[PDB]
Amino acid sequence: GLVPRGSHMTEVLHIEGHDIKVTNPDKVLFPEDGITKGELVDYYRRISGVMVPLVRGRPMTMQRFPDGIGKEGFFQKEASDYFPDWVHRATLELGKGGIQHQVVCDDAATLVYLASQAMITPHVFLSRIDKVHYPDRLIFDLDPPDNNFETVRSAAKTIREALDAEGYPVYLMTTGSRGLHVVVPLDRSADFDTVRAFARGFGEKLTKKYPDRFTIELSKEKRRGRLFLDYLRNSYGQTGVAPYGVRARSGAPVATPITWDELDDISGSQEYNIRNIMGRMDKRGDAWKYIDKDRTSIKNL
Ligand code: NA
């Protein structure tokens, strides 16, 4: 279950002053691809320059696969006791009662260390820990009911035009699976309840305009094949796949920020993957480089 590549039993990377040990780097995590633990860590190391700004401050849930994606992996919200103290934790009060300590990935060392701990996919809050109930992202999470990319691509364009028509900045990323997130950056002046009411009301208006096409029906059977305008990530405690996060799918696809024009150049949500994304970055640059400069507020409050 190796692709031997000359690695030592343990490689030590030196990132931002921290020694990060990568044990068994030639262990295969993607069996159809021969993508090893080391190659995954190297992906997160080179992508860190663009990804760190997009995940810093966010409570992060880890989807870890110590034996690769062909075997069972797990979600983990409570930070491991053995993570070094320089890996930031956020202290969160559970609605249950009591507290949870989640990782916050505030720098490249942390990102690389989490990859070395077999994190494949990071999932992050729509808010940052210094104002954890006040999102800086509004997400519409679009998946096609027919598993056809054109279905989600056309919905994403219409939704973008509807938000652009109201005066909002609209950003976009693939999820590296089947879907797209349409994203409005926010200035953190409204709390989640306000943002989510907006998102639901917007979805409701869009549904009334295109009633055979879109739905906000919460029950899957009532949808009757219409695309769900999923506003439900806009709550405290919800996560979305991190921008530049790897999915646990063959080919190692990446949830990639893309421009609206680029949406027509691609063929599907898994267009970019750890092995072809560097060519993309070289040619196109980070589509979300200025996302936070466009941070805005909900109109008519
Ligand atoms: Na939100």
Numbering used by the authors: 13 to 313
Provide passages from the article that reported this PDB entry:
The AP–NHEJ repair complex is primarily composed of a Ku homodimer, DNA ligase (Lig), DNA polymerase (Pol) and a phosphoesterase (PE). Studies on NHEJ repair in Mtu and the archaeon Methanocella paludicola (Mpa) demonstrated that both species possess equivalent core AP–NHEJ components, with orthologous proteins possessing near identical substrate specificities. We discovered that Pol has DNA strand displacement activity during RNA synthesis and that PE resects excessive incorporation to promote efficient break ligation. In this current study, we sought to extend our understanding of AP–NHEJ by comparing crystal structures of the archaeal (Mpa) Pol and PE with those of the established bacterial (M. tuberculosis and P. aeruginosa) DSB repair complexes.
We purified Mpa Pol and crystallized the enzyme, as described in the methods. The structure of Mpa Pol was elucidated at 1.95 Å resolution and a ribbon representation of its structural features is shown in Figure 3A. Mpa Pol shares close structural homology with the bacterial NHEJ polymerases from M. tuberculosis and P. aeruginosa. Based on the close structural similarities between all these polymerases, we can infer that the key structural elements such as Loop 1, Loop 2, the 5′-phosphate binding pocket and the active site perform similar functions in the DSB repair process. Having shown that Mpa Pol is a bona fide member of the AP–NHEJ polymerase family, we next superposed the structure onto that of Mtu PolDom in complex with an incoming nucleotide and DNA. We found that the nucleotide and DNA substrate of the Mtu PolDom structures overlaid precisely with the Mpa Pol structure. The Mpa and Mtu Pols do not have strictly conserved primary amino acid sequences, yet both Loop 1 and Loop 2 adopt similar formations, suggesting a conserved function. We previously reported that Mpa Pol, in common with other NHEJ polymerases, is preferentially a DNA-dependent RNA polymerase with an innate capacity to perform strand displacement synthesis. Examination of the crystal structures of Pol reveals that these enzymes contain a prominent surface protrusion that plays a critical role in this displacement activity. We identify that a conserved arginine residue in this structure acts as a molecular wedge against the annealed interface of the downstream DNA and is critical for enabling displacement synthesis during polymerase extension that occurs during AP–NHEJ repair. The structural architecture of the archaeal NHEJ Pol reported here shows that it is highly similar to the bacterial NHEJ polymerases, supporting conservation in the functional mechanisms of these enzymes in DSB repair.
